[PDB]
Each structure stands twice: as C-alpha cells, then as structure tokens.
Design an enzyme around this catalytic site. Structure first.
Site, PDB file in Angstrom:
ATOM      1  N   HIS A 178       0.849  -1.153   0.000  1.00 13.07           N
ATOM      2  CA  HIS A 178       0.000   0.000   0.000  1.00 13.07           C
ATOM      3  C   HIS A 178       0.882   1.199   0.000  1.00 13.07           C
ATOM      4  CE1 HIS A 178       0.447  -0.780   4.453  1.00 13.07           C
ATOM      5  NE2 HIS A 178       1.210   0.279   4.207  1.00 13.07           N
TER       6      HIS A 178
HETATM    7  C1  LIG Z   1       0.714   0.310  11.631  1.00 10.81           C
HETATM    8  C2  LIG Z   1      -0.452   0.256  12.619  1.00 10.81           C
HETATM    9  C3  LIG Z   1      -1.322  -0.713  12.487  1.00 10.81           C
HETATM   10  N1  LIG Z   1      -2.407  -0.862  13.330  1.00 10.81           N
HETATM   11  C4  LIG Z   1      -3.329  -2.004  13.139  1.00 10.81           C
HETATM   12  C5  LIG Z   1      -4.587  -1.733  12.330  1.00 10.81           C
HETATM   13  C6  LIG Z   1      -4.885  -3.074  11.620  1.00 10.81           C
HETATM   14  O1  LIG Z   1      -6.061  -3.727  12.147  1.00 10.81           O
HETATM   15  C7  LIG Z   1      -3.567  -3.851  11.752  1.00 10.81           C
HETATM   16  C8  LIG Z   1      -2.901  -4.305  10.472  1.00 10.81           C
HETATM   17  O2  LIG Z   1      -1.919  -3.343  10.044  1.00 10.81           O
HETATM   18  P1  LIG Z   1      -1.655  -3.147   8.469  1.00 10.81           P
HETATM   19  O3  LIG Z   1      -0.422  -3.842   8.030  1.00 10.81           O
HETATM   20  O4  LIG Z   1      -1.518  -1.705   8.143  1.00 10.81           O
HETATM   21  O5  LIG Z   1      -2.954  -3.718   7.591  1.00 10.81           O
HETATM   22  P2  LIG Z   1      -3.594  -5.101   7.236  1.00 10.81           P
HETATM   23  O6  LIG Z   1      -3.899  -5.937   8.435  1.00 10.81           O
HETATM   24  O7  LIG Z   1      -4.861  -4.843   6.508  1.00 10.81           O
HETATM   25  O8  LIG Z   1      -2.650  -5.847   6.372  1.00 10.81           O
HETATM   26  O9  LIG Z   1      -2.637  -3.031  12.486  1.00 10.81           O
HETATM   27  C9  LIG Z   1      -2.624   0.021  14.356  1.00 10.81           C
HETATM   28  O10 LIG Z   1      -3.572  -0.063  15.119  1.00 10.81           O
HETATM   29  N2  LIG Z   1      -1.689   1.017  14.470  1.00 10.81           N
HETATM   30  C10 LIG Z   1      -0.579   1.216  13.658  1.00 10.81           C
HETATM   31  O11 LIG Z   1       0.167   2.152  13.893  1.00 10.81           O
END
Ligand SMILES: Cc1cn([C@H]2C[C@H](O)[C@@H](COP(=O)(O)OP(=O)(O)O)O2)c(=O)[nH]c1=O
Ligand SMILES: Cc1cn([C@H]2C[C@H](O)[C@@H](COP(=O)(O)OP(=O)(O)O)O2)c(=O)[nH]c1=O
Lengths: 134, 135
Positions: free
Chosen positions: B48
């Site tokens: 992303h």
């Molecule tokens: C990077 C980051 C992620 N998160 C949480 C939100 C998401 O539910 C989870 C996953 O991070 P992410 O890698 O950004 O997305 P995805 O799971 O869709 O691949 O991390 C936070 O709460 N705070 C942060 O600073």
C-alpha cells in the site's frame, strides 16, 4: 507505584505489532528515539537520572533486567517482551543489566540528547530528590 | 541516495548505540513509533501507499527485504542493519518481504495511525499518481 506499560498488541498469521503514539499511549511527546544493540561484555549501564527528560524503555528482543528508583521505591523489572514498556519519569534513577546477547533495547525520549540533564551520582540523585521533596 | 539513511552509529566495549532525533537525522516529527516482531509465515506485509504519511523503516534485528515504488521507478533494499534507515515518503507504494525469524522491524512515523491515509490498491495508486503528475 507501577511504571510498566503494557501496549495493545496486534496479532495474526504474520506476527506481532505494537504501536506507540506520543501523548497517546505515552505521557509525552517524542523527539528522540534510540537503541542499544550488539551488546557484549558484562557491564551494565545507565546509572543516571534526569531532571527534565521523560522516557520509555523497551526490550524489542531478548531481554534485560531494569532497576528503577524514583527516590521512593526501587523497582526491578525484567524486560523480555516488546509489548511491555517501562516509564522512566524525570528524577528517576535507572539501570540496565543482564543484557541478553541477542538483546535489542529501545528508548523513546521526549527530548534531544542533553548530557547536562544527567545526574551521575546515585548520591546526588538521592539529594536532588530531597530538595525536590521541599 | 535520498531514500536510504545512514545513521551515525556508536560502538564501544559494551555494544552499539544509534540515536535518531526528530528533524535531525530524519526529515520529520516523530508522532508514533511502531514495530513488528515474532514474525512467521511466507505471506508478505505492506502493499500500500500512504497519501500524507512520512515513514522510516529500521531493521533492529535479523532482516527484511523491502520494495519501493513511487509509481515511477522501483527499488529494492534489504534492511539488515540497525544503523540503516529507509525513508518512505508520501505516495510511495511499499512492501515488506522475507522477514527473518528473528526480525524486528521498527517504523518511525510522522503521524498517528489512520486507516484513511492508505492506498491499498495498486491501480488506484498508479492512478493516484497519474492524477498527481498532471498537477
Ligand atoms: C501500523 C499500525 C497498524 N495498526 C493495526 C490496524 C490493523 O487492524 C492492523 C494491520 O496493520 P496493516 O499492516 O496496516 O494492515 P492489514 O492488516 O490490513 O494488512 O494493524 C494500528 O492499530 N496502528 C498502527 O500504527
Ligand atoms: C542515549 C544517547 C547516547 N548518545 C551517545 C552518548 C555517548 O557518546 C554514547 C553512549 O553513552 P551512554 O550509554 O548514554 O553513557 P556513557 O557515557 O556511560 O557511555 O552514545 C547520543 O549521542 N545520544 C543519545 O541520545
């Protein structure tokens, strides 16, 4: 008075994540981040106190044993989880020991490195506290 | 060159020290510090782009293979030194691969987590960029 901070930790098939936001899950504004790695020898470190600086110490790998003294209580804490943060307030003495070999230690400070803010005599620390106490 | 960051490292009898200082050896103000660990699996991470967020990725332990794309050119760098940081600016697609088992990956960010600053689709990202170029 407990100084430990357990951070909310995300988990999944991928691994773990822990997010740390200034003035959110921590009492201060971040201005400096530092870390100690690739440690060797058997000498501890720290043994100082700060008048203005605020920190949070985290063991991101391995583990290390921390001793905190706020001039009220000496606390000893073994860190071995990146999800546990140790708040080191101003006018609080600290020491790191038992740094595992694979240990990585990280520190979040609310302010730029200032040698002048450092108390290096346990005894002077002890005194500084008293005065503070009146 | 403008992406890779070389942090001054301090080495002594005791070990190594690296200090990052907001706006000092990093182009922005630290509002959040996050990190990944206890990794496992073969499914990557990232994929992303962010619209406004400025980041810096640091492999505090083990390794990670990262991919970068500013729509334009693609770059790859394998972070395996706590002293190296990697600047990831707004509008930059990115991916994290090959996390060693012992990998600790830290990230310094300009602002708090915000689900809405993301671009989770490459095509839109591509679009996003195009739209921008015209500007
Ligand atoms: C990077 C980051 C992620 N998160 C949480 C939100 C998401 O539910 C989870 C996953 O991070 P992410 O890698 O950004 O997305 P995805 O799971 O869709 O691949 O991390 C936070 O709460 N705070 C942060 O600073
Ligand atoms: C913590 C820190 C250390 N350093 C430097 C200070 C020293 O030159 C070195 C390690 O010192 P440090 O471990 O703090 O104290 P000591 O003098 O007992 O070794 O790293 C910085 O430049 N900035 C920082 O924020």
């Amino acid at each position: 008075e407990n100084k430990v901070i357990n951070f909310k930790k995300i988990i999944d098939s991928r691994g773990s994540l822990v997010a740390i936001e200034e003035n959110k899950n921590i009492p201060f504004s971040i201005k400096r981040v530092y870390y100690i790695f690739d440690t060797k020898g058997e000498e501890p470190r720290g043994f100082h106190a700060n008048k203005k600086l605020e920190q949070v110490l985290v063991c991101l790998n391995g583990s290390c044993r921390v001793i905190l003294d706020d001039g009220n209580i000496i606390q000893e804490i073994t860190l071995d989880s990146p999800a546990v943060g140790l708040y080191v307030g101003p006018a609080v003495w600290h020491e790191m020991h038992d740094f595992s070999s694979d240990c990585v230690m990280m520190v979040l400070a609310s302010d730029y490195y200032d040698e002048t803010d450092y108390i290096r005599q346990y005894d002077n620390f002890k005194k500084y506290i008293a005065k503070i106490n009146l």
